[model samples]
Target: PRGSHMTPKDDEFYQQWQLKYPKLILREASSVSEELHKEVQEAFLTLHKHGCLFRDLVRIQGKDLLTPVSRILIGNPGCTYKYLNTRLFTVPWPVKAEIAAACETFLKLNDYLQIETIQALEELAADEVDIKSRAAYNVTLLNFMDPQKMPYLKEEPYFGMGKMAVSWHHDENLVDRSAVAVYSYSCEGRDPDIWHVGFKISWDIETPGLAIPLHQGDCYFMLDDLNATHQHCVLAGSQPRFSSTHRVAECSTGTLDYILQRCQLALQNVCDDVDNDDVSLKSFEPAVLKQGEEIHNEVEFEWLRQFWFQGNRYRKCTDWWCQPMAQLEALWKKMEGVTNAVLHEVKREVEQRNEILTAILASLTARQNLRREWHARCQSRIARTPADQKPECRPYWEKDDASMPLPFDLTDIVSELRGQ
Candidate 1:
């Protein structure tokens, strides 16, 4: 049922392209039992019900745009040292015993895939790759793609290609050739062709894209330069689908400690503010809230940018989240207090800022129209036809970042007690 025709890549190059890479290594569906699927599904539902999840923003690698992805991260961030981008997230795990146990089950499944992948992958591995494998996995992602909530593509070729649950890109920040194991479960009855995992060698004209069906209870992995060469995307189905993908994310101890320290400081400052009784106005502002900043307009982005940046997961923690479930829930309540304390000012700031940016965008629209007219007039002149006098076009927008309008300063107001 896997079809490569009628897709955007149908006309792309083939023959040799089809034979170049090893195909997806899928483990048996029986390995994931009915009872375990229901348990795992329950864990995810409980996590969401308990207020432990957030739809975090993603920074497209080479673009100035910030987009919030539909997918969520379950445990640990592997997307560089706290630079949260690419729908990368650090969601809280309230179902600690449950999710980590669920994670273990999937991880164990990968053990089966890893051996077979390395063996199957070696078919292509003997030709070009180092054929390496990872001993452990430190990253887990919760892939939840609901079409209604997905950020659909805005351009052609990729537009409507797939729900932006994940777009076309090779995996980032993982060891080269390290296999990623993905397992799926969904609400619908068993249908093997429900959705697809799409892939293609990077825009090489001589290459055609590959689309493979991957439905519920099935597992898949691709190794041996698959990460280096091919790009993949998850084509979502009508029903919501959930999957857990585990990978060996390369994270530095330095990055780990930095997040740890920030978490400690964040807790202290919020607790510090708590120590004093509240009045209409406060004296000192916490330094922990500001950016390790270069650019100004990032507070909105920073708050939900990284997982550990939001809560504590330092050395004081066990295999689960930072503390006992009850204690962790209480700590989250305290943090919410700090957010409420400043909520109004930030809300006010955004509306006011929106008014300014809207006007700026309006100006850009007019200027863009003017340039379009001028170009048409010049074309008429070149064709030996009469046209109006040349209008001024003095300021040309050359910077790619020009379209991204942001406030000159995003720093929060300082309190009189901080002694500025």
Candidate 2:
């Protein structure tokens, strides 16, 4: 064995093959010590199956973090749907509070951005600590979105999400450049709005901690461009969550239906557990809003307010679907001015047409007189050859005529006009 041909060469090959299989580095690797691995594994297994515990981790680190697997959202087909992953896994309890806080932030941020585009509100969002104050401001600007002009939010799930296509060109003149974005909350399994319009993003790479609650008023929203957007639904917890409700008095039937259906579903799901005799269909009649009573002007403005996302910006939108109202009333008042402008232009055209007709008639009459005199002369004139024989004034006998003026007689005015 001292110097055999085998000389431990086989030893190196044996050690190489004996090495363990490779390990995968988990993105969210837990830091539990080796000594506590058993305890951690046991706890993880027990809580992993539980509802409350599972909800918490997702709430804390549950954002769709930008891992290697995440596809870019710059421009994709039906991206809104893809981003809105509909698999509703219940959030764990440890992060539930964080999720709640993040929900409020998300809502306030959404509301803030409703009225403000990313370019317009970047500074404000950066400056403001609270999102609701800006939301109040957004309420004032809601009148800008003409419900009649916009596509229905209830069209389908892919509508308000980023999947909604932007027009190739900016149509500032027509206001068609505006896009739609919608959102909803669900503790129970069902969400009518989400089903209709597509899904809302719970979190993204930029705001991965969105589900974590920093404060009551802290919020953030994407303000990329001019788009009609929605927010995520508040989960059912002991605390109430903030959300946007824009079913106004003046909204379209489609909008009205969307709000009513969503509210009905929420009420039915949330209220079924709690007993309250006062909560009857009749009680909701006032909120149901009559056709004219629906405050159209303020509702659109309020919907736009989430774009503002200020905590104390109530005064910014004093009327805000309430008493004082926003710019809706002013916009409605302008309808009369628009009508008057159109009428004035129409009246001027009518007068001009009459003047043109009178001038044309006068010209025709003057021409008729000249035409009659010319015809008389033409009838009496005789074709005569200038010669010694013709010197004596002969009766109007025609001689060989080479050329003469041709006279036109009008039997029909239509034919005469055509000739002229």
Candidate 3:
């Protein structure tokens, strides 16, 4: 599923060029609190063990190179990054809501990173809170590298002479030159052993430019020209190292915001058992409700709603399969004519509800697309404005509540039919 689509020739050209210029920044000491470190570490390990972490793979020159490190993208919906000659789409982390909220809080608490980066960007052009807000770090690529599971000699040809052949690269995927944050969480070993290599510029990749070892609980912010100009890499570390890199850029954030709010309401309704017929939600609640129970509920609700509707709406014919078999059998034995009529009625009702659901589903898609297009147009206008003259931004619904019809209103019709 990773490389489902073959990339076109234009993609190959872009991947080859626009390489990172070697710029380097390092903060050696740990500033993160112990509790935060533990929480982040636990989250990373859980995600990794669940087979959610994807091996860093890329398609280049018709070859699929599966690198040793594991990675996953957790960010705003539709935010993507290009690397290893392929485009990597963001996969909402299982704990995305919690992480997203947590990261937002962390940035608010530590406004220095924002202020520092904003000032740096202002040196080059006009800066405003609106601009900073729009381009703030909204996504992160969780890179996990471990040597125990992937032992190798530096001389191996596949990975090249063992200095961990990860080439020098910069974070240029984002639209704005925002500062990049790299938070390190060490796993089961000395943090210093996980050395990070940085270069002054692309001119001298052969010789060592800077070697900074990252310790657990350490956080570094690559600000201004440093982030734009330097390229950094963590060549095979001796032990496992997990890095959370955060960034933000122009994306389907508006649509995602809309989706997130809908999910919250849907989850609340589900947890309240509003839809008693959803077997998947009923089955999932027992196991997933303990940790960040409310947050997990919303995430599961979002998954079921999006996946069931968009993925496989007709996978399970619950109405047909979930019939009371014993009652039907008894009716068949006692009154064959009556049993036939009841069965026919059941089938007719099922068909009627199915037809109504189908229409609602179609309308849902149309509504989402209409609102998404409207939001995209507004966002485009905001982005096109000069930095010095920021345009007002408003929620799509607030801008035109009448035109932005909600899809959930159709659910009320379904509710009424069920009551009847």
Candidate 4:
């Protein structure tokens, strides 16, 4: 049930590729080694097999992957301790170059797969009529949701479109994984809107089981402000839940390797065709120059161009969305007051609820005491009541008739004793 033979190119597959590839590089050689250097080249091959995850997020999402991981890389975590900060991000030029190349590989690979997958779907749908064509369209749908098991897949006209759209748009993440921060922002208007920007890394917490809801907010899915993440209702009044969050996910090495393997074959084919070079991968390495351990991009192949080192500066604003100057000023205006209000409301609500519960418990405690007192009073009264006066109430333990109370409440003993 859980296979990707004809599945849609999973975006998390690539995000995981990014995280794991780097970590593996970090581990194999404290500094970038030939093996680490090759991961950049190998990464494209992997990404090509599977499209980068979060591709949907980046194109449609309105923000950056400016999460804790990015912050750690960008030095935002050390705002207070400037001098002692080592920038936590390990950037020996050699490693940085490899990372940049890998990022580039990610971009081309994303574009290539989008074309291939979409085309594959279109061809699959080509000859069918409306209903049939609709079913035929997106051949990858069957890969994710089996027609046999998922009744909706067979019963519905649009196949898995409705279910897929709603679940992706509105469902809370429920698996353990990692994510990357790209960018984040909001709109300016009388009814202003805002959102966090980035792609999510989805993974299987249990590598060998059928995937179930793993944990709350532990899954992967790409969210973008521009997309219709509005399948779920937004509050009509003053509740401000129209935004996004700031958590980043960590990816596993195995997932990354899986993606890379797939992409590698795709890229190799594409690159070979483009370059018209039948260059053996083995021979390609020795000719590679080491600019003080870093491979120069000028010497790198066209397919091996790095993404981060090129045009997109993470800090510098390229488009209107990324301008920090405009962002910071607007950010204060939009966030400061609303954030404070939300925090205050949350705190007060919790406190009020706690107080109400405490008072109710205290009242219950008083009632318990009252019940105990009533029980004690009943026992005392029972002990003092005369046995013969209320004959029906006595004689639970005695054996003789005189020692027992009469069944008909007879008071002859009392009368006789009084007369005597």
Candidate 5:
């Protein structure tokens, strides 16, 4: 089910493309037992019920934009993932013992595929083959996809195309384009009729390239060259699908100490320096305020803006809601103290400043009114003067000289009052 349609004449160029281009090695279904598969499904449901699942939301230009699918990470403790504009740090979930055991069972089904991946690399001009195989698989990314939440492209007046399911992209986030394993799973009879299409380019006009169907329990492997020269995607599927994407990380310390250090740094540096351009007081929408209803004026926006800044800043790091069940209560307990302390300090400072400002407003307004009158009187006196007339003595009160200095120095008076 996975070969080119080129004739003998086209084989000249096609063979060249195949040697270093797109290549796929697929193993059919029935590799794993029904009981083990059932156990995995049950384990995932347990994982879901306990709240280790989350939808991927990306941060873009200071806005949190929503993505279509949900995912849960199951990997080594310090393992992390960076995709699009977000980075996720992984912590071992409680079900790791169960899922990792199930993962071992599934990996046993793909022994040949793993060997084939290593053998293919032998053809390369590498000096060592065993070392090469070791270099290909150091980390894995387990991404679970729910069909109900998966987004689809709009197709009405025109066929609009832009969804992760159908979009053709290479797994380029990793440092090395090493061997990758893709295992598909679904419920008993709800087999998702998924199609994976691989193409070197957007061959819309020319020959659209090879495609193959992936069934439940089936494992697919692609060589490193596939990503360098071609793109692939799940062309069609309806029922929910779970895929375990395994890749080799070129840079990972694989230690709990390193992981904890990274997580601590991430918590401390969660986008605090991101400029908040929308914090202006006048940016509040009048329509939302609605004159008669509970009015949320500039002051409200000020509070909300401060809250947004802090909230968003904290959210940029680890998400408490997305943590594993065992860590939930513990993390919450720690966060309770942190948040309450922060809120208390901010509230105290705000209240203190508001009190000081309120106390001075009446006196400040009086001084401002006096300065306004003084400027107006000077303007009036100037307007009444003739252009040809030289300066003559006028009333001391009306004169624009030392006699009419600022009614009173408000700063000196305010300082004196505050000192008292």
Candidate 6:
């Protein structure tokens, strides 16, 4: 999250920043056809419901700030609860095959991007496609940014700066060489040029930055090193857009809890149906519509595959979940066992922290000597400034926000365009 004061400046700032930092790259992987984009858009919609992707009510400082977009994730789940922050939703949206295929082309095109490749082959057998791993891209983040749905308010203006789709920050939990590949789709009533991603040179946060006008079917990859050198963000726009960012999120507890949570939700769905007689061949079919309308997302497909959505050892094509209560019960048992193991592992890791803290204290003491050695140069040379004279580093958010200046307030631009 970025400071609310970090509103987007006008295109002049963008053009100037581009000139100053022309080498900051956002490489194209490949573009999908408008027809393909539409198909993907439709497929993704099947699971874009409240459960599958929802904006988190983030409590920061004191108040709850609503995220401007809804998010859902797919991939490795050994990370902590910090991954989702809250309970995630489930929709039997069947778009994994389409979304998964979208990222595959890039992994081949940018062959050096090995970090995004599957690392955990521990779960499955070697396959016909030579996919010995459980998944292709280990982690993919789905963002649903619709103006009509997850609105960023102007009245309480985030950080006293008007609008921001996503605030500036580094992508967390990524593997080295993981060129994060992202694909975007313009949604219904979308403003063609309203949204663009902004990037600030990491070394010069005070300076203006650049942006790329992302549109439907735009596919781009950011090489891993870029995250450390530059920070990126979503500049608030007029309408809505959907983007699936593919990356290799770390396989720690943070990521683990996210997938584990979804596993539980999906397990509950299947478990509930066991007592009923609604079992039919019609089950799990990708409907043209669902509940009230079409909604979509991913991770839920993993559950489908767990129940054999793929015909054994497969990501190729899906086969239906086995029906016999005997077979169905077997799956339920498998899921429950897996869930138990995942939970117990988390408990084990948490318990081990007590043991590790002793070593951490010794390591920290060693770090104090190294830190003082580096600072000694500045102290002896009187380099930079007398470190004691530094200004009070108070948080701006804690004070009355009226004094916070936003020379680039974007709400006026949006309001004027609408004749409001």
Number of the top-ranking candidate, with TM-score as the measure: 1
The candidate that achieves the highest lDDT relative to the unseen native structure: 1
Question: For model 6, what is the C-alpha lDDT against the true structure?
Answer: 0.41
lDDT of 5: 0.42
Q: What lDDT tens digits, residue by residue, belong to model 2 across residues 1-420?
A: 121111113454233222310010101113223333333233322322321121100111333211111111111111111112211111111112333332233334334335543333444334342322322321110100111232332221322122111111111111122222222221111222221111222332121111111122222232322222213322122222222221111122213234334334323312244333222222122222221112221222222221121112222212122321233223322321222222233335234333323323333344345344333322332313112111111111232522211112232431333322
* Candidates by TM-score, descending order: 1, 5, 3, 6, 4, 2
lDDT of 1 by residue, 93-158 (tens): 322354445445544454544555556655643422345445244556655655445455432143
What is candidate 5's lDDT per residue for 257-337, written digit by digit as tens? 443343333224122343232111221122211221111111111122222212222222234323332232222223222
**Candidate 4 lDDT tens digits, 1-420:** 332211013445344534432211101122223443344336433432332211110112422211111121211111111111111111111112434454443333223323332343344334323322222111010001112232332111111111221122322221222111111111110111211112112332222111111111121222222122222211111111111121221212112233233334323322243232232221112112111011111111111111211122322211221332232323222222222222233344234333323222332233234333322332443324322211111102233434222211133322332321
Q: Give the TM-scores of the predictions, in the order they appear.
A: 0.51, 0.17, 0.46, 0.18, 0.48, 0.44
Model 6 shows how many backbone clashes? 23
lDDT of each: 0.44, 0.23, 0.43, 0.23, 0.42, 0.41
Poorest stretch of ten by lDDT in candidate 3: 312-321
By lDDT, the better pick of 1 and 6 is 1
The C-alpha local distance difference test score for the whole of candidate 4 amounts to 0.23
> Native-vs-model 1 lDDT?
0.44
Ranking by lDDT: 1, 3, 5, 6, 2, 4
171-253 per-residue lDDT for model 6 (tens digits):
76565534466676656412234666666767674564555666566665555366767777776566777877766555543
Q: Which ten residues in a row have the lowest lDDT in candidate 4?
A: 137-146
Model 2 regions lying over 4 Å from their true place: 1-104, 107-325, 348-420
Write the number of the candidate with greater lDDT, choosing between 2 and 6: 6
